[PDB]
Amino acid sequence: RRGPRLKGLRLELPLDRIVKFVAVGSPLLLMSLAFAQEFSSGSPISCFSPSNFSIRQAAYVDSSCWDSLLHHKQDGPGQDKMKSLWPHKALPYSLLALALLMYLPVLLWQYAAVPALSSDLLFIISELDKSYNRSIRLVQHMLKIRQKSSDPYVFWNELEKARKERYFEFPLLERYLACKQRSHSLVATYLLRNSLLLIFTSATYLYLGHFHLDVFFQEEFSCSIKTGLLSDETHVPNLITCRLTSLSIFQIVSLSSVAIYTILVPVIIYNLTRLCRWDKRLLSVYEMLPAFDLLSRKMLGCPINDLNVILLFLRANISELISFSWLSVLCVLKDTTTDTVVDFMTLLAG
């Protein structure tokens, strides 16, 4: 039971997982599409060499014109003195670099803040189950006292006496939460990961705005082979002019990437917005029980604190651990009640 519980612990939340998967998969899918087009078209570009050229010489012209992009500019018949068509060649490598950059912050977060968070969460839940059991065991005596005397004054007096009994309130948890309220490692790592994601998205936006808008259409370009040593070769023409077939793919890729990452600009910000606010209905739900009461009163300071991330993960986990399926119903009863405690006690006893 305990062993399986530790393994099932969610240490990356349910929503950030989809963001990570999208941000790491989209560039890989686009790069795979680029390679698929490269191997489907056979030749990345096609050139209109004169009829005299044999097949091997035409292939030489094709290869030399396609390989001379990263080194020298090539100008089309609508452009200024120079235009750079290098992004057509380095597209898949840039996509791989983007994928690695987007994956980096995930590795940073995991390696830097998985162990401390795991230890804190497991300790807290282990203490909290026992705390809940100890808190509930007193409800029987509370019910007996309430049955004996109906007036609410004695009920309140006995509630205060039980709170002062000192059989609970777990000073271990008190001091641990007090220490956590100062720590900043978890919030630092979370904010840093989100900021890295935002910075890399902005880097992609800049890359696609500077080096893709200029040559977005760039149908054809006038290549040259005489720049080398065969400058005295009269057989070859001077300015063989040719085009690149995969252009459409390139276009789509660029646009596609932009769109996807725009969808990820709000969501990520929302993830960063979660910390600035304490997690309210559930707060009122858990205020009643002493076991959760101790951690409920630790929300007077600035919302940015190491205990805030622990609270987020604790809620995301207790939604399934099992220790939440009851108090919610009890507080639903309390909301419905104009007796609620008696009904809850009967249900718990059953």
Ligand X SMILES: *[C@@H]1O[C@H](CO)[C@@H](O)[C@H](O)[C@H]1NC(C)=O
Structure tokens at 130: 């026992």
String of contacts with its own copies for each residue 174-203, x by CB under 8 A: -xx-xx------------------------
Shortest Cβ 236–ligand X spacing (Å) = 7
Partner interacting with residue 47 (select from its own copies, ligand X, none; CB below 5-8 Å by kind): its own copies
**Main-chain dihedrals φ then ψ at residue 325, nearest 5 degrees:** -65, -10
Partner interacting with residue 46 (select from its own copies, ligand X, none; CB below 5-8 Å by kind): its own copies
Partner interacting with residue 237 (select from ligand X, its own copies, none; CB below 5-8 Å by kind): ligand X
Amino acid at site 311 = L
CB within 8 A of 326, min separation 6: which ones? 348
> Do the bridges between strand 220-222 and strand 241-244 make them parallel or antiparallel, or are there none, so unpaired?
antiparallel
Residues 224-253 that bind ligand X (CB under 6 A): 234-235, 237
Asked if residue 52 binds its own copies (CB under 8 A), the reply is yes
Residues 262-321 that bind its own copies (CB under 8 A): 319-320
Q: What is the DSSP string of 172-232?
A: HHHHHHHHHTT--HHHHHHHHHHHHHHHHHHHHHHHHHHSSSTTSS--EEE--STTSSTTS
Burial (0-12, 13-18, 19+ Cβ within 10 Å), 29? middle
Shortest Cβ 58–ligand X spacing (Å) = 12
Asked if residue 206 binds its own copies (CB under 8 A), the reply is no
Tell which one of 13, 267, 333, 341 touches its own copies (CB under 8 A): 333
Residues 263-292 that bind ligand X (CB under 6 A): none
Q: At what angle do helices 91-137 and 171-180 cross, to 10 degrees?
A: 150
Residues 36-95 that bind ligand X (CB under 6 A): 50, 52
Number of alpha carbons in the 13 Å side-chain half-sphere of residue 146: 15
Shortest Cβ 157–its own copies spacing (Å) = 27
Among 274, 284, 281, residue whose Cα is nearest residue 311: 274
String of contacts with ligand X for each residue 8-27, x by CB under 6 A: --------------------
Partner interacting with residue 110 (select from ligand X, its own copies, none; CB below 5-8 Å by kind): none
